[PDB]
Sequence to fold (296 residues):
Amino acid sequence: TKVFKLSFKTPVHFGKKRLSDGEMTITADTLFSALFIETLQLGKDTDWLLNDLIISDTFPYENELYYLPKPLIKIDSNHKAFKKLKYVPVHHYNQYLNGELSAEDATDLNDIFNIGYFSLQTKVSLIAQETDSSADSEPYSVGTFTFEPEAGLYFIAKGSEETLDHLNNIMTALQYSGLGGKRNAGYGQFEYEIINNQQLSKLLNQNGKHSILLSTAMAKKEEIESALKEARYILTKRSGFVQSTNYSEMLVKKSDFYSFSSGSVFKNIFNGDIFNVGHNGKHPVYRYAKPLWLEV
RNA sequence: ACGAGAACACGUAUGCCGAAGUAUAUAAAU
Fold:
C-alpha cells in the first residue's frame, strides 16, 4: 500500500467535456484505463492487474503539502467559505472533521491553494483545403494546466506485494508515454517518486464509524439498497470514447455512466466493481469503480 | 479499454519617401 507522486515538467490537458476545457485532477477511471492500456501495450497478463488492484483518485500536491478532497459531512455552524473550498491539507484534516477548522482558517488555507494555473493554447490546422486550394485555416483551442515546479499529482494504491511490483513496472513504462488529453501533442509526460508520508500513512490507518470514499465507485446491483442507507453523496456523469476497438471512432463511445463523487460519506461500506460499458465492440471496455476508504 | 483520436497561429507583405556639413569672415599688423 504505497503511494505514488507525479511530476510533469510539461503542462498536461485533462478535460471534462470539450478539448478547450481544462482540469487539475483526474479520477480513478482515467488512471485505471491508462494503466490497463499500457499493460496491453506491454502485453502482459491483465487478470492479475484486473481484479486485485485498488487505486484512489488523483490528488494535487504542493512543495511539501499533501491534500485530500473535501468530505461532504453535515457541519452545523457561515456556509459561504466552506462552499468555495475543495481540498484540505493533512495537517488539519481530522481537525476539520472535528470542527476545529475556523472560517478564517479556511480563508488562510484557500489562500495557500496556489498549486498551478490554467491556460488556453490556440492551435491552427492546415491539413484542410487551405493548403490544397482556396479555403481557410481551422483554428481551435485547448486548455492546459501548468503545475508549479514542486507541484503535481499523486494516488493511493493498495494490493498484494506482487500486485505492487507489477504496478511499479507498468508505472515506469508509462512514465514516458502521456496522460490527460493530447498526449501526443506535447503534453503530459512525467517522472514519479514513491514517498511514504508517515502522517498520511496514519491517516489511511485509522478506524471509525464513517468512511470517506476516495475513488470513483458505484456498488453492484445487489448492494445498492443496503449501501444507500445513510449517505451524503454526489453523482458524476462519466462519458468518453475508446481507442482501437471498432472501425469508426466517432461511432465508438462508452455509454454515459454514473458513479459517486470523491467526497461522499457512507455508513455501510460496499465493495465496488469494474463495470463493462461495452456494446458493439470487438473487445470489452473497462471502466473502474472500486473504493479505497479512509476510515474516519 | 485515458471527454479520446487526427490538426505547422499558418499564407501576403520591410523601414521606406524628400532632404547640400551649410551661411560670411585678409595668414595679419616692423
